[PDB]
Amino acid sequence: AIRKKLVIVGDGACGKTCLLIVFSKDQFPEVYVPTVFENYVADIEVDGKQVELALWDTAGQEDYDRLRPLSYPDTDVILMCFSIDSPDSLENIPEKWTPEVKHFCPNVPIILVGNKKDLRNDEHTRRELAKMKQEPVKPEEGRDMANRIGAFGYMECSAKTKDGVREVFEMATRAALQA
Amino acid sequence: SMEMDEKDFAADSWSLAVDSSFLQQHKKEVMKQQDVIYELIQTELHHVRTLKIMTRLFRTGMLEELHLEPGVVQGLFPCVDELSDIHTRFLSQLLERRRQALCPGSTRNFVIHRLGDLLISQFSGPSAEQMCKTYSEFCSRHSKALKLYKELYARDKRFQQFIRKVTRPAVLKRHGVQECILLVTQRITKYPLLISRILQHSHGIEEERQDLTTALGLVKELLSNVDEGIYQLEKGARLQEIYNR
C-alpha cells in the first residue's frame, strides 16, 4: 500500500472535525461525540489500488497564522469544507482559504465539500437564516464556487446520516494518487 | 502508557467508563461535563504516550543502534525531553485529581468538580513560561526536523531499516516520525476547544465557571505568544534571507 496524506481546512463551524470522526469510525457516535480529532490512518482500496490515507484536522488552528501552516507539508489532497447551513462559511472560501492552500500546497488537488447537507431541508435552519436574509447553500452555488477556485471537484455529505461520507474519502484517495 | 492508566481510559466516554449504577445517580448536565473532562485527560495520556515513542523508541533507539553524525538526533527530535517533562507533570496532576475523587471501594467511579484551578496553575507562572519557550522553539524547528528525516530515510540504508523495523507493529500505525512531530505541534491548539466545551457544562458552580473562563483566557494568551514567536529555521539558510524576511 502507498502512503498518502489528507488535510481538511475550513472555518470553525464547517463540520470538518465531525466528518473525520464519522469516517474513521464508520459511525456517527451514539453515546459521545468527541470534541477533537488527533489523527488516523485509514486503509482504503479505490479502483483496485490500496492506500494508507493519513487524516489530519486543522480545527483550533484558525486564529494562529504561523502554527496553522505547519499542518501542510507533504499534503497529497486537501478537503476544503464549508457548511450548507452557513452561506458565510462559503463566502470565506475564495479569498482566505484558497490563496493559503495554493501557496503552501502548490499543485495539490482541492476537493470543495459542502458539509451538513441534511440541513438544506431543516425548518429550524431555514427560519434562522431567513432572519439574516439568507438561505441554505444551493448545489449550484457550491459547484460554481468549486469551479471558480480551481477545485478538482465538488462533493456534498452529511456526517449526521453518513450519506456521502465514504464517497468523499474514496474520491480524495483517487485525487491523491493522480500525477 | 502504563496498563493501569490505559485501562482507566479504555472506554469511549466517562459515561461508559463508570459503573452504570454510578452513572444513574447523576444529572445529565454532570454526565456531559464529565465526558469532556474525560476526553481532555484521555487525549493528554495519548499525547504523553506520543512523546514517549519519540524519546524512547525513536531517539534512544537511534543513539543505541545507529552511527548518525553529532547533532542529527537532536535535529530530528528538538525539545522532546523538555516537552516530555511539561506534559508528564501535567498528566500526573490530572490523574491525581481523578484518583482523589474515586469512591472508596472503586477504581473507576469518580466526578471531578474542580478542574479550573488545575488549568489556571498549568497555564500561568513558571509552567506557562516554560510551555511558551519550549513550543516556540519546537514549532520553529518543525520544518527542519521533517526535512532532516526525509533526507536520512532516502539516503541511509541502516536508518531506513531501523525506521521500518520499529514502525512495523500495528500499534505504531499512526505514529511514524513525521506523524509524531505534527501530533505534538497540534496538541496546544486542542486545549481551547476542550476547555470551552467543559466550560459550557460547568455553570452549576459559579466559582468553577469563573475559573474555567480564566483558564481559557490564559491558554489563548499562551497560544498567541507562541504563534508570534515562530520563524521556521532552515538548514543552509543565509543571513541575507533571514534579515530580508
Ligand SMILES: CS(=O)(=O)c1cccc2cccnc12
Ligand atoms: C498563513 S497566512 O494566513 O498568514 C497566509 C495566507 C496566504 C498566503 C500566505 C503566504 C505567506 C505566508 N502566510 C500566508
Ligand SMILES: CS(=O)(=O)c1cccc2cccnc12
Ligand atoms: C471489570 S471490567 O474490566 O470489565 C471494567 C473495566 C472498566 C470499566 C467497566 C465498567 C463496567 C463494568 N466493567 C468495567
